[PDB]
Design a protein around this ligand. Structure first.
Ligand SMILES: [Zn+2]
Ligand SMILES: [Zn+2]
Length: 82
């Protein structure tokens, strides 16, 4: 019984150039069924954002999902010039 997308969910804007949208999205991860494995950042304002949206690997997401791991989004992994 997969939950459709009637109400809100992870269909948001992980970034300013996000493309994740059920209108044309699908379960890419092998551990997922029909939803983007969003990730939480730990830099000042922790937020939620898709993983593939930042050119990430499915394995790294699994490893980072082990529990204890300083996970960092893409816009806060190497802040310096922009
Ligand atoms: Zn996104
Ligand atoms: Zn972040």
């Amino acid at each position: 019984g997969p939950l459709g997308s009637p109400e809100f969910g992870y269909w948001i804007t992980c970034c300013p150039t996000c493309d994740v949208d059920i209108n044309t999205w699908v379960p890419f991860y092998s551990t997922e069924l029909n939803k983007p494995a969003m990730i939480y950042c730990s830099h000042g304002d922790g937020h939620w954002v898709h993983a593939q949206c930042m050119d990430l690997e499915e394995r790294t997401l699994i490893h980072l999902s082990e529990g204890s791991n300083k996970y960092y989004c893409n816009e806060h992994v190497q802040i310096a010039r922009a």
